[PDB]
Amino acid sequence: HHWGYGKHNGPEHWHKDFPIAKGERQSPVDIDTHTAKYDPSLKPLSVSYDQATSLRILNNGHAFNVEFDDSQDKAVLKGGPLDGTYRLIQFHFHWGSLDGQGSEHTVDKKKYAAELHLVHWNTKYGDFGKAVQQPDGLAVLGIFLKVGSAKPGLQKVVDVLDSIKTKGKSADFTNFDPRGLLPESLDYWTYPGSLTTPPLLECVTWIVLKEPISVSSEQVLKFRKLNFNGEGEPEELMVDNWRPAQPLKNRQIKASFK
Ligand SMILES: C[C@@]12CC[C@@H]3C(=C1CC[C@H](OS(N)(=O)=O)C2)CC[C@@H]1CC(=O)C[C@]13C
Numbered sequence: 350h351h352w353g354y355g356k357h358n359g360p361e362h363w364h365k366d367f368p369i370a371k372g373e374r375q376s377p378v379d380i381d382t383h384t385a386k387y388d389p390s391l392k393p394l395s396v397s398y399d400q401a402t403s404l405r406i407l408n409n410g411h412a413f414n415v416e417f418d419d420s421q422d423k424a425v426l427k428g429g430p431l432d433g434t435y436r437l438i439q440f441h442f443h444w445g446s447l448d449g450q451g452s453e454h455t456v457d458k459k460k461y462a463a464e465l466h467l468v469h470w471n472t473k474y475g476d477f478g479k480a481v482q483q484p485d486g487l488a489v490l491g492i493f494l495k496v497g498s499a500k501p502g503l504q505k506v507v508d509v510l511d512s513i514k515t516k517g518k519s520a521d522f523t524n525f526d527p528r529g530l531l532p533e534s535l536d537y538w539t540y541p542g543s544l545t546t547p548p549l550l551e552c553v554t555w556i557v558l559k560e561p562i563s564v565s566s567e568q569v570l571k572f573r574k575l576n577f578n579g580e581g582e583p584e585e586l587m588v589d590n591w592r593p594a595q596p597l598k599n600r601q602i603k604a605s606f607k
């Protein structure tokens with residue numbers, strides 16, 4: 350009876366195995382655009398993905414993960430609100446059963462069809478497992494998806510999903526360029542928070558881009574054909590793999606833009 354997104358093991362249940370679920374800096378949150386303070390001291394985000402080396406894509410029974418070789422200082426996030434350099438280790442998405450839901454962060458209570466997370470770890474802690482034990486261990490870049498025009502840079506991802514339909518399936522996924530998933534503007538909101546899945550560790554500097562990317566209805570329909578279950582188990586579509594907004598508590602959301 351492991352965690353998931355269903356009636357009996359979904360987010361309202363997680364606190365039993367992961368009591369930090371009711372903690373002081375949980376994610377995601379609603380971004381109230383009128384209350385977010387413009388912070389002129391915030392730097393432009395530095396997204397250096399020219400040398401990114403993807404290796405593999407994986408269905409872990411909750412999402413699909415595109416994994417990167419983080420053995421060298423290649424694909425790095427720095428600047429913005431961050432001190433030092435954070436290395437890209439994987440990206441994944443959260444999405445809905447319908448276009449009206451699927452994002453984890455909300456903007457003035459607006460839900461997007463999906464949300465892309467690019468997960469980076471702080472090089473001062475040497476690896477991902479040690480970083481998640483530190484309050485400044487991770488930087489997650491969050492990008493909203495809306496349904497409209499296709500995102501050509503997403504299609505290589507959509508086309509491999511047939512090969513990883515069920516939990517535990519993986520595929521070689523080399524030479525994928527995550528620059529093709531970025532919107533034009535790097536204007537962002539930032540706040541201190543957590544992983545949005547168990548173990549829900551309070552180790553994340555969230556950086557959420559204001560500008561969504563557009564993906565086609567056909568692209569997001571192929572996300573919704575994935576399965577939470579393993580090969581040869583009853584079919585449960587992988588949809589609504591999002592945690593709802595959590596209480597902001599004693600936190601300030603800062604805006605990089607006026
Ligand atoms: C980074 C992710 C997915 C890749 C995965 C882990 C998480 C932890 C939860 C994060 O979700 S969220 N929504 O908070 O960004 C995403 C847990 C540890 C795994 C070990 C491994 O082989 C792959 C790793 C790193």
Ligand SMILES: [Zn+2]
Binds near residue numbers: 443
């Ligand atoms: Zn995520």
